[PDB]
Design a binder for this molecule. Sequence first.
Ligand SMILES: Nc1ncnc2c1ncn2[C@@H]1O[C@H](COP(=O)(O)OP(=O)(O)OP(=O)(O)O)[C@H](O)[C@H]1O
Ligand SMILES: CC(=O)C1=C(O)N2[C@H](C1=O)[C@H]1c3c[nH]c4cccc(c34)C[C@H]1C2(C)C
Ligand SMILES: [K+]
Ligand SMILES: [Mg+2]
Ligand SMILES: [Mg+2]
Length: 994
Amino acid sequence: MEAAHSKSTEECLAYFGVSETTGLTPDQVKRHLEKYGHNELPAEEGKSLWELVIEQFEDLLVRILLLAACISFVLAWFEEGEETITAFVEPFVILLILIANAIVGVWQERNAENAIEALKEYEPEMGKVYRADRKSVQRIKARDIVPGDIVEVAVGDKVPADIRILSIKSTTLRVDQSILTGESVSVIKHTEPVPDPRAVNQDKKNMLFSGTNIAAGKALGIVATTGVSTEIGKIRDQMAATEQDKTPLQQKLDEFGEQLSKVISLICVAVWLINIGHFNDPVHGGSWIRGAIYYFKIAVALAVAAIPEGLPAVITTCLALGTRRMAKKNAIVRSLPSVETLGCTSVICSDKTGTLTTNQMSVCKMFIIDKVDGDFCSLNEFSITGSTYAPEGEVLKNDKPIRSGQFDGLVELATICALCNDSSLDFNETKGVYEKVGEATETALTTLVEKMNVFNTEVRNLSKVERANACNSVIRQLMKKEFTLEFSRDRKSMSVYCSPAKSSRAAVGNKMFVKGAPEGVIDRCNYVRVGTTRVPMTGPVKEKILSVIKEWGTGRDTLRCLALATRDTPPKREEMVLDDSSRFMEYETDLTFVGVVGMLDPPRKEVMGSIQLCRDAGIRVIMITGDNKGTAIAICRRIGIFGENEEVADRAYTGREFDDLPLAEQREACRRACCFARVEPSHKSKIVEYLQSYDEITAMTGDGVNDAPALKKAEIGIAMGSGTAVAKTASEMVLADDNFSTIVAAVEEGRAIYNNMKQFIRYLISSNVGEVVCIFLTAALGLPEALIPVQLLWVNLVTDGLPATALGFNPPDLDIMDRPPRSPKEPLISGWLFFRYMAIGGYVGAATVGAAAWWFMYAEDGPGVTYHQLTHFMQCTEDHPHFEGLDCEIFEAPEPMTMALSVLVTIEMCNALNSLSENQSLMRMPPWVNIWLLGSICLSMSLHFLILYVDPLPMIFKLKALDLTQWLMVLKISLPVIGLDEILKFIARNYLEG
Ligand SMILES: Nc1ncnc2c1ncn2[C@@H]1O[C@H](COP(=O)(O)OP(=O)(O)OP(=O)(O)O)[C@H](O)[C@H]1O
Ligand SMILES: CC(=O)C1=C(O)N2[C@H](C1=O)[C@H]1c3c[nH]c4cccc(c34)C[C@H]1C2(C)C
Ligand SMILES: [K+]
Ligand SMILES: [Mg+2]
Ligand SMILES: [Mg+2]
């Protein structure tokens, strides 16, 4: 059943061929069940951590090692009858690093909770039907409802499916549709058609939508659609959409992953080319094995060298410290990578109600008549502060404070608010806050009455639970509410019939106390109360009143306005017929006007300030609200999204206006406009999609089920601490305390993380380029092994890891928030900076070959053929009597390596100091500054000795502790590094850009 709202009740009945009075036969039920399925959202399991691990190896750069390890395991096995008792470390360290790293990656995006599980909580298990085979309402499983079912719902039901309402049994049906609108206000249903086929939820006043709940009354309807075809079904489909998302930063990292590998691959042809360059002279005397494994020896080494294994630990650690400082701010970060995202965000879309606002309806203004004299009428106007339901607040006249009980008019106003009311207030002792019981607009009246305290009741000493309704009980003691003329559509108001407590049924002094929509109520007054007197309602008194009502209704006041009145001489109860609501407007006539109250749902107090700081960081703030446009706008103005008088014709839309724009126009409207009102959940994610199609990194902030699709679709979803579970579990971050200031601090953190990552990516890859450069020289110069895989894995996980993690501990830049955000198209490392790690790289590459190549020559400790003849590790015994005169097993020595690796280390240590500042020479920013980094260098340095001295280690990594002379050379070749970056740091600070 499509478009049931745009037809008549009989058209919907006829449509399925059912009587409203008997229901489906159980044959119809069978058929309809086969044809439409069951009435439930399908579960989404969500990937079990086997399939995640497996997916971690789905990208090249890991597959590249997963391949290696195997070949190092091919090599691990086919080891000569020599170093046999641990040739296997290579394969296994490697394969263990794979798992580790891959575990970390899955772990950091954690999260059991499942947003569809949370959302099926709004599926009732039971619903109620009429069907042909029994006369009375049957109470079956909700999932067994089919389209065409006659269903009944009543107070506190969860609506089990999407239903066209057939008849309303009570005088009104009041619905809470907050899962589709964000708003808890009751919607007053009716049964007429709503012909517009494009009507939005807010407009389908003749439908019940599944998962909302009935706040008052009783209704029968016909099911139109069920399961996945409902409004909650749409929300569910958009939260499925699990197109594996990555942050902006993760994608960058991946781009960078893909480039690293299309390095490694080109270097292996290159290393395969200078090899097949001298493949034309093997003197063929030792099998094509000695060369077969000469690739997949340096081809493993080429991978271990180029990959910065390690990045994942120090990156994960970086994020993890950010996440911990955001905890101190009461921002919980559910997904470690999103602790960075807001740092590059350019647009923040925000829900209003409960997010930007407190979602506590408050009476902020009221008035009564002051004085009347022919055409002269003045008002007493008052303001009331407080924006929670808590009874804390004061009443002002002119911004000076007053005692309400001194105005007789305020006394009667409070009286009407307390009696003409079906809600109350509760203190929630577990949560330590006041909470409404019943409707927000009514509860507003309750808190008002408690802030007026018109009879000077003593409340300083009441427990908070007792305080919740102290003043109201006082008023209830004066006057007994006998019955309510409940609210009806034809009169726009409601009343309560009351007798003085302590009077007899026959006595005089019965009153009706009326509240409602100002116009109808003001027309039914013939009098105005002045103090404790009464005078005739006249044209200019009415005119005066309507005048400020008008104003209050339409500023960036734009307040919900209620008139309060009293029937001084109501009819005798006997004369009233209660069962006939159509009679009620007449019973509510000959009224005395008393006062007007103006309420709104107010912004949280830090929002205005937060919006202005986003603006300073170049972030746009856009409101997407299920609520109506006039409040949307008015609030945008109170919080600085619009200036107090900006014109906003082309800058604010309803759902329905937006749906009338063409595609190109909609898309443009998301750049031009700042206020989107009366929308559906789909509109929110659609606006997000459009903003993202200009390549903006887009955030979503909110609290509702109606927000979940947009939070999921944004680059980051931020949920409020007091909102729904559904919103919370679609989010990456939660503001536990609801402080929107935290957003701005989250931006600051974000930028600071990006900067860290830049600085220790540059610092580590540097190292990485030097090792590729050694390995490609202990090759194209047929040279003995300068550095081995077991070793680079150590420098690359640990000795570089401790400092890289230590550069972490920088206090952020002073100026990171005064600057728009980085463009999505700004590469990680680029330009100067790439050149600058390159040059570091090569110098390492050339420095490590050397210190090896110079414990082979100039080095008293192993005088080798000092005219470059060290190139031939081929003709060992092969040409033993050639250019020789001593040993044979001298290349496999640890020394050439222990000088080679000692330099790859001492060089990266200095680099760890260069690296404290991208540009400010070590001269001007002293290198003692970050202590933890020097700390880190001692940890690293000492560890480097553990592998030279602690008995077992110097065999695995094949080393030997060095002569004092030895280090002092390592040190003569490493210390220059500093003056190297320095020439790159003068050139930067100056003859470059500045
Ligand atoms: N219990 C009540 N007591 C007094 N007045 C009420 C009561 N309930 C509703 N009203 C008044 O009459 C209306 C009730 O809702 P209505 O169907 O007219 O929707 P609406 O306010 O015009 O907005 P929307 O565009 O979201 O449909 C007013 O908005 C409101 O202030
Ligand atoms: C086993 C596994 O899950 C992983 C890891 O083990 N790693 C990283 C990683 O994600 C790999 C990776 C992907 N993209 C980049 C960019 C920069 C650095 C790295 C990566 C490290 C890669 C590897 C294999 C060390
Ligand atoms: K998201
Ligand atoms: Mg991974
Ligand atoms: Mg909300």
